[PDB]
Amino acid sequence: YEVHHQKLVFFAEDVGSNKGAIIGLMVGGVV
Amino acid sequence: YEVHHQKLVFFAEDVGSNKGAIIGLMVGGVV
Amino acid sequence: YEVHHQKLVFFAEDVGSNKGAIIGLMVGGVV
Amino acid sequence: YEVHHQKLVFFAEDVGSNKGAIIGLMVGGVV
Amino acid sequence: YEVHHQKLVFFAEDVGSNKGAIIGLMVGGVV
Amino acid sequence: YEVHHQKLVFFAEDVGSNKGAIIGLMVGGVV
């Protein structure tokens, strides 16, 4: 009543992100 | 009543982002 | 009543993210 | 007669794609 | 007669893909 | 007659994929 304070913090980071390497397939070579 | 304060913070970063490398396929060579 | 304080913090990080390496298949070579 | 008739096929599909839903954060209502 | 008739097939599908739902955080309501 | 007729098949599917649901945290309501 006399004193009322409210603090709300929402934080999200790195969701569904790719920092590495994604590859379907790789071949050294064909002979 | 006498004192009323409200603080709301929403923060989001790096969602569905690609900082690495994505490749379908790679081949050294064919002979 | 006289004094009222509320603090809420929500934090999430690294969800469904890939920092390593994902590959379907790899072959040294075919002869 | 030595060597002939070679057939090579490479196929890659759906790599690093998003068909679903990616959301950093969801909030109904506040106060 | 020596060596011929070679058939090679490479197939990769659905690598590092998201068909579901990825959410950093979900909140109904606050106060 | 020496050596011929070779058939090689490589198949990879659904690697590191998400068809379900991944959530960092879920909260109904607060106060």
CB pair distance less than 8 Å for A14 and C15: yes
List all chains that touch chain B, counting a touch as 3 or more CB pairs closer than 8 Å. Answer: A, D, E
Domain carrying residue D20? 1-31
**Strand F21-23, strand E21-23: pairing:** parallel
Residue A12's domain is classified under what CATH number?
Answer: 4.10.230.10
- Phi (first) and psi of residue C25, to 5 degrees: -160, 155
Specify the DSSP element, H or E, that contains E8: strand E6-15
Q: Look at residue E4 and give its three-state secondary structure.
A: coil
CB pair distance less than 8 Å for A1 and B2: yes
CB pair distance less than 8 Å for F17 and E14: yes
Specify the DSSP element, H or E, that contains E13: strand E6-15
Nearest of F26, A28, F7 to residue D7 by alpha carbon: F7
B5 is in an annotated binding site: yes
Resolution, expressed in angstroms to one decimal: 2.8
Please provide the DSSP assignment of chain C as one string.
--EEEEEEEEEEEEES-B-SEEEEEEES-B-
All residues of chain E having their beta carbon less than 8 Å from the beta carbon of residue C6 are 31
Please give the Cα distance from D27 to E11 (Å, whole number). Answer: 42
Q: Are D5 and E4 in contact (CB under 8 A)?
A: yes
Experimental technique: cryo-EM
Q: Which of B1, B13, B25 sits opposite A1 (nearest CB)?
A: B1
Number of domains in chain D: 1
Two tokens, residue C28: 């040294």
Q: Are F27 and E27 in contact (CB under 8 A)?
A: yes
Strand partners, E10: D10, F10
